[PDB]
C-alpha cells in the first residue's frame, strides 16, 4: 500500500472529521493487583509521551507497492485455491438487504457500536437511528442508499487500545479505516453468502479460521495439519498488500461465481480516505474497517503462501499444503519440512515482510509445543489427551484486566478473560480468581469456578 496524495479536506470540498482526543481507557479496580506494562495508545499529535512526529508514524505502515502484475506463480496459486473453494458449492446468489443488515444463518447482524462512517458521521446520524432489530426494516437504509449511494470515503480513526511503551513513544498507533454503512450493506449483499460459507466452514478447505470458536476448533486443527508445521509473522500485513494481490483475489472470486461484483474489491485496493481535516488516496493496502476485511485478508494469505511455495519449491504439491489463516495470522503445514527463512526472502519480492514466528530472533522449527495461532498455544488435556486446549498466555489477560473503558462492562470483560484464562490450568486459574477477589469490585462479580468451566468444556464436543 502507498498514499498517492494527501491534502486538506476543504480543498476538495470535504468536512472536517471529529476524532476524540482523549482515551476512554482508565485504570481499573485491578490496575495494581496485576502486573502490566501497557498503556493507552497516542490518540493525538500533542500527547506528552510522543518522541517522534505522530502523523508520520501512523502512516508509515504504507511501505509501498512492490509488485505491479500478477505473475505465473500467483496465477497458479489462484487456480489451486479457487479449485478448493469450488468444492464448497458456495451459493453465489446476492443477499437480500434484510439478511444483509440484521443477519441470517452464518452472518451476524451489523454491529450498532461501530461508526456509520461518511456522510453520517458529519450529519451526526447514528446506526441506531437507521436500523433496528425489531421490525427488521429495509425502508430507511434503502432510502439512504439511493440518496448517497455507495463507494463513499473511508473515515479514519486512531484505534483506542493498549500499546507497549515503545509504540507509544513512536506514535505507532493503529488506524481504523471505517466504511460507510452504505458500502458495508452493499458488500454484505454482494458477498454475504460468501461470508456465511466461510464462517460455517473454518478449516483447511477455506483455509480460514474467521468466525471460529477456539474452545472447540483447537481440537480439530492438529488433525487437519500435515506432519510438518511452518509459520512466520508479517510486519504490517494489511498495509503492505500491493494492487496485484487484490487482482489475484478478484481472479479467485470470478472463478467461484462472483466476477459479478469484483468491482467492490477495487475500492478496498484503490481507496479514498478522510482523517481529521485531511483527505488522502491510497493505492493498495487492505482497509482495516470494511465489510469482509478479515475474510479477504485470509483469502489473500492463502494466495500468498501458495505463491511463495510455488516460487521457492517448484514441484511442491499444494494439495498437501494444509493451512488456516485469520487475516495475516496463519498456522500451516506440509508433509515435508520447508524453510520459512527462504519463504520470507521470496516474500520481499512480493512486497511482504515476513519474520520468525512469534518475535523469534531466528527462524526455528515450529512444533506443537511452540506454535501459536490467535495468540493461543495448543495443549492436550491431561485426562483426555484427544481434547486440545487453546492456551492464551496469562500475561495477555493481565494486561487487559488492568484497564477499563466502561465500568458497566466490568462483569462481561472479566468473565470473558476467565473463559480464556482457565485453559492455563486449575492452579493458575484459582490464583487468578483469588487476585480478582482481593478487591471489592472483584468480590462482587459473578465468575465461574474451574470445575464448572472444565466439565462444560468436556461436554461441548
Swiss-Prot record:
Membrane topology: Peripheral membrane protein
Organism: Poliovirus type 1 (strain Mahoney)
Catalytic activity: RNA(n) + a ribonucleoside 5'-triphosphate = RNA(n+1) + diphosphate
Protein name: RNA-directed RNA polymerase
Cofactor(s) the protein requires to work: Mg(2+)
Binding site residues for Mg(2+) 2: 233, 328
Domain RdRp catalytic, chain residue ranges per copy: 227-342
Lineage of origin: Viruses, Riboviria, Orthornavirae, Pisuviricota, Pisoniviricetes
Protein purpose: Replicates the viral genomic RNA on the surface of intracellular membranes. May form linear arrays of subunits that propagate along a strong head-to-tail interaction called interface-I. Covalently attaches UMP to a tyrosine of VPg, which is used to prime RNA synthesis. The positive stranded RNA genome is first replicated at virus induced membranous vesicles, creating a dsRNA genomic replication form. This dsRNA is then used as template to synthesize positive stranded RNA genomes. ss(+)RNA genomes are either translated, replicated or encapsidated.
Parent-protein residues present: 1749 to 2209 of 2209
Binding site for Mg(2+) 1: 233, 328
Regulation affecting activity: Replication or transcription is subject to high level of random mutations by the nucleotide analog ribavirin.
CC cofactor note: Binds 2 magnesium ions that constitute a dinuclear catalytic metal center. The magnesium ions are not prebound but only present for catalysis. Requires the presence of 3CDpro or 3CPro.
Cellular localization per UniProt: Host cytoplasmic vesicle membrane
Intervals, Cytoplasmic compartment: 1-461
Amino acid at each position: 500500500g502507498e498514499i498517492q496524495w494527501m491534502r486538506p479536506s476543504k480543498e476538495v470540498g470535504y468536512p472536517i472529521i471529529n476524532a476524540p482526543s482523549k482515551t476512554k481507557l482508565e485504570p481499573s479496580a485491578f490496575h495494581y493487583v496485576f502486573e502490566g506494562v501497557k498503556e493507552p495508545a497516542v490518540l493525538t499529535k500533542n500527547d506528552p509521551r510522543l518522541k517522534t512526529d505522530f502523523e508520520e508514524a501512523i502512516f508509515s505502515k504504507y511501505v509501498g507497492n512492490k509488485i505491479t502484475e500478477v505473475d505465473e506463480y500467483m496465477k497458479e496459486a489462484v487456480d489451486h485455491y479457487a479449485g478448493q473453494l469450488m468444492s464448497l458449492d458456495i451459493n453465489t446468489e446476492q443477499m437480500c438487504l434484510e439478511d444483509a443488515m440484521y443477519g441470517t444463518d452464518g452472518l451476524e447482524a451489523l454491529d450498532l457500536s461501530t461508526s456509520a462512517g461518511y456522510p453520517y458521521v458529519a450529519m451526526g446520524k447514528k446506526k441506531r437511528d437507521i436500523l433496528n432489530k425489531q421490525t427488521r426494516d429495509t425502508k430507511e437504509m434503502q432510502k439512504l442508499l439511493d440518496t448517497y449511494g455507495i463507494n463513499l470515503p473511508l473515515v479514519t480513526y486512531v484505534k483506542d487500545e493498549l500499546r507497549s511503551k515503545t509504540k507509544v513513544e513512536q506514535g505507532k498507533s493503529r488506524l481504523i479505516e471505517a466504511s460507510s454503512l452504505n458500502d458495508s450493506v452493499a458488500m454484505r449483499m454482494a458477498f454475504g453468502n460468501l461470508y456465511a460459507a466461510f464462517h460455517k466452514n473454518p478449516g483447511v478447505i477455506t483455509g480460514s479460521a474467521v468466525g471460529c470458536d477456539p474452545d472447540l476448533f483447537w481440537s480439530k486443527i492438529p488433525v487437519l495439519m500435515e506432519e510438518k508445521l511452518f509459520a512466520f509473522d508479517y510486519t504490517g500485513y494489511d498495509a503492505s498488500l500491493s494492487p496485484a494481490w487484490f487482482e489475484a483475489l478478484k481472479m479467485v472470486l470470478e472463478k467461484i461465481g462472483f466476477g459479478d461484483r469484483v468491482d467492490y474489491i477495487d475500492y478496498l485496493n484503490h481507496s479514498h480516505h478522510l482523517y481529521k481535516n485531511k483527505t488522502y488516496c491510497v493505492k493498495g493496502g487492505m482497509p482495516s474497517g470494511c465489510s469482509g476485511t478479515s475474510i479477504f485478508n485470509s483469502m489473500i494469505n492463502n494466495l500468498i503462501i501458495r505463491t511463495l511455495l510455488l516460487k521457492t519449491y517448484k514441484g511442491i504439491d499444494l494439495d498437501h499444503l494444509k493451512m488456516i489463516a485469520y487475516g495475516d495470522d496463519v498456522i500451516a503445514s506440509y508433509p515435508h519440512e520447508v524453510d520459512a527463512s527462504l519463504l520470507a526472502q521470496s516474500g520481499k519480492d512480493y512486497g511482504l515482510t515476513m519474520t520468525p514466528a512469534d518475535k523469534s530472533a531466528t527462524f526455528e522449527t515450529v512444533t506443537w509445543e511452540n506454535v501459536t495461532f490467535l495468540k493461543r498455544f495448543f495443549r492436550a488435556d491431561e485426562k483426555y489427551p484427544f481434547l486440545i486446549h487453546p492456551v492464551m498466555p496469562m500475561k495477555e489477560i493481565h494486561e487487559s484486566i488492568r484497564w477499563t473503558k466502561d465500568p458497566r462492562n466490568t462483569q462481561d470483560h472479566v468473565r470473558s478473560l476467565c473463559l480464556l484464562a482457565w485453559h492455563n490450568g486449575e492452579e493458575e486459574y484459582n490464583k487468578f480468581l483469588a487476585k480478582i477477589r482481593s478487591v471489592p469490585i472483584g468480590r462482587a462479580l459473578d465468575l465461574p469456578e474451574y470445575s464448572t468451566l472444565y466439565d462444560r468444556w468436556l461436554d461441548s464436543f
